[PDB]
Amino acid sequence: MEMGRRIHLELRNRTPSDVKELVLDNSRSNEGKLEGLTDEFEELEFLSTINVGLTSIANLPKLNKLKKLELSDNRVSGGLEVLAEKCPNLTHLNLSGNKIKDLSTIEPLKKLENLKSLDLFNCEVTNLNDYRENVFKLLPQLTYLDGYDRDDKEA
């Protein structure tokens, strides 16, 4: 199975601007990328990339309608500033299970202002003193986190 097969199954061989969500899960990728998603995409709301072996974020269509994106179980470790230049309209961010070394990796999210929830589970950065407080004062725009900002609501 490949990203192309998932794209064909979800789109069912139709125009790219017909679905506002994608499910790219359990898909092998060339050197850890997210190919199979052409830049021609114009409308997209939800994303899902799990067990894709994504190692970096360097290929992504420019978008202005996406609000949620899901990355998990990946060895990606690099600056995410490119998201601002690609789609500065993210509201739900999920990095659960990813591999991030230190706090500097999550710095480039400051320039994004629409993010309200960020998820980081069993991450090497999560095991630090005052990581919760340090992240909060580092990303003032954030309104939610792993789930315990002040209360518990569901996405």
Add this chain to the structure above:
Amino acid sequence: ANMTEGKSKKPKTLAKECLEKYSTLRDQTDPILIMKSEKANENFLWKL
């Protein structure tokens, strides 16, 4: 966690109530072994 008024109760009753609240874990009979010690036997520990 099992919220309580604040009364003092025997540990056995507290454990019983806590397992009742999380009944799914208590009624687990098929173990999905994840890791094993070099010498210990998983079956014996699970049965215990």
Add this chain to the structure above:
Amino acid sequence: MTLAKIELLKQLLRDNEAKTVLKQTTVDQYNIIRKFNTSRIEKNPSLRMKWAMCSNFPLALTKGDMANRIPLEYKGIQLKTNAEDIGTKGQMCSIAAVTWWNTYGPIGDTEGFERVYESFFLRKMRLDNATWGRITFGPVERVRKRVLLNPLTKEMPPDEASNVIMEILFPKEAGIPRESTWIHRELIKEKREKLKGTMITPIVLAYMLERELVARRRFLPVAGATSAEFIEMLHCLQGENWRQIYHPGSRSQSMIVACRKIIRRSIVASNPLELAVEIANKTVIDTEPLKSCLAAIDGGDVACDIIRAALGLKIRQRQRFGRLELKRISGRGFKNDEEILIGNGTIQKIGIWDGEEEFHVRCGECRGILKKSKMKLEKLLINSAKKEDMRDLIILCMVFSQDTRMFQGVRGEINFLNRAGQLLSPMYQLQRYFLNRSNDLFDQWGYEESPKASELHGINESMNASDYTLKGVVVTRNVIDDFSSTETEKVSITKNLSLIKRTGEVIMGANDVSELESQAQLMITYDTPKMWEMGTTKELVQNTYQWVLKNLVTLKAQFLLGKEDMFQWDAFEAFESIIPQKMAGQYSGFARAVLKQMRDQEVMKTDQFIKLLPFCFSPPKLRSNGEPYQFLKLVLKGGGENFIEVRKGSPLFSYNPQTEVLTICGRMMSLKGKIEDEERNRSMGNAVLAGFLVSGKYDPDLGDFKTIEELEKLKPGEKANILLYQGKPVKVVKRKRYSALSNDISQGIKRQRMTVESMG
């Protein structure tokens, strides 16, 4: 070879004797024909083998092309000869060629041994990983017991074992699969897949499977554990004057609980037998009906024995009274009604046994011999096994003996019932009274001097090995071995579940079962609404989801039609009991709207369909305007963890599509995927020639016969010409459904009794 087969057949028929015998003896009679061998068995195998090993070519090689791999003489050593043979019609050879083959020659495949000889390698694994301990040189007390020599993958009776073996490794000759392949479908498919890819002779595999399935049991002297794993090593573990510590490298409690629940459910109603058997054969334990472990173990708890009697199975004919297992030794007791005053002052009319009698008595781990006369216990010999078991044995034998002292020792009252609320006979009422208050007849029974002797030593009322014992009771420091001649004699079953001998005598009563509740260590999934309206909400949800899952094909087919008849199913009525009354209607309306949307504007999604279907049993209550209410969290009775998540999953229900698995009430089940493709993968076991019924005779209109692979090509409802068993041409029709004879019989009985009651 088939041409060689036909040529050999023609040559054999050329003689008139072959023609007359072949055309005379039917296929069934073939067995007799085979047994007419010379039987000139060697008188002394040792001498024969010794002589043969010194002969030039004792080995009898089968004619073939293998010999060309090896010369008739290698390195100046004679190996094989080209002289003809009369005994086997092959060639002759010597062990020299065998050793050379072990040295050089063709190299075979090593895969087959990984799985084919699974039992032997499992034995080796259990030996290697076992942990040894100290050795206790002191004397060891051993009891003679009927033990299973070797562990079994799935114990089954010999006939079922043979049928399963044939269904596994003999795809042909599989006419009309019985009511045994569906029970063992998982074993069938597992062994079929494992043994595929081999080239060993089929008879070897058949014998190995027979060893792996058919049970082997024997009388052995054992002390301690008794599972087959320990019996394998009994030769090293045990010892007349030495013992070793050994730890080799469940369903029972669940079946006990299920049988007890079935007994309690059926007794309260009239005609308990039919209802009990319906529930028993409609029950399942995680992969199989109850006739998969009941038929495995020998005997068991009284409830299991009664259920087996209700079903078709063999039960040990020991007399169960409360917990006592009694085996008569001699004497005949005349059961005559008599009026006896009880110690409480009341007078009861009950049956008493005139005449002397003796019984071997067992209870848990306690064995003994009891000798009783009418209205009196005479003698009791026991071994020290356990305080609880010894007390139970003493009290139960006391009550059974109907000793006048036991009656005069009553002090309270006897008006008890069972969990079903029924008044029992005075004997069982007294049993319960004395067991509840053990220190009632013990105090006034009277004491007897200690058994002054080399080994015979007494026991006091407290069960401690203390002298000044009870009148009659004696504890011998020896081993009492009892319960011989387990004839499994013919036993009848009355409607009220109480068994009786070939004569009118009663062996097991409906009330022998003890009213003790436990927790099923496994998923006890029934198939009848009547049963599961007892337990907790989690059990109800699990059973409803299992009912939905089992008959997924029918529900999925009815979904396409789009009619409300699909939702008005009795299976969900019990579910209605665990949904809040004030809000169940809103759930039903919301789920109905969601499922209509699913049918209209999207495609199949099994997980959400299963999740949302059951809540629609109750009538809907739409919004004032008319639109359905919307929810995302269905609350259930008990609150807290008893709640369903509409979106992805919850404690009671969570389906993961990455691996396509289903977790219900903390239990993982394999939904390979969706689609009739996954339906057929579920049907990947079953049995060869299971989708075809028999109808008509040869009917040569179809010409020659067709194989199973070509049989599948035919569309449902066609007619095909096939061979049944060893020949027997017949005409068959491909089935359009899956059948269950037990369900049909149960429904017929239900209709019959409904008619009887309506006329009455």
Add this chain to the structure above:
Amino acid sequence: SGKYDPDLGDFKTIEELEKLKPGEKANILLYQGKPVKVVKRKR
């Protein structure tokens, strides 16, 4: 709005009360043996 209804579930902690939504009814406990049933209000 009512009284103790075991069907609705056990008593709800402040954590669940704070995250509750208007128009939803819950159960609370004043002291040992005096439970009560309450409902959220917009005002």
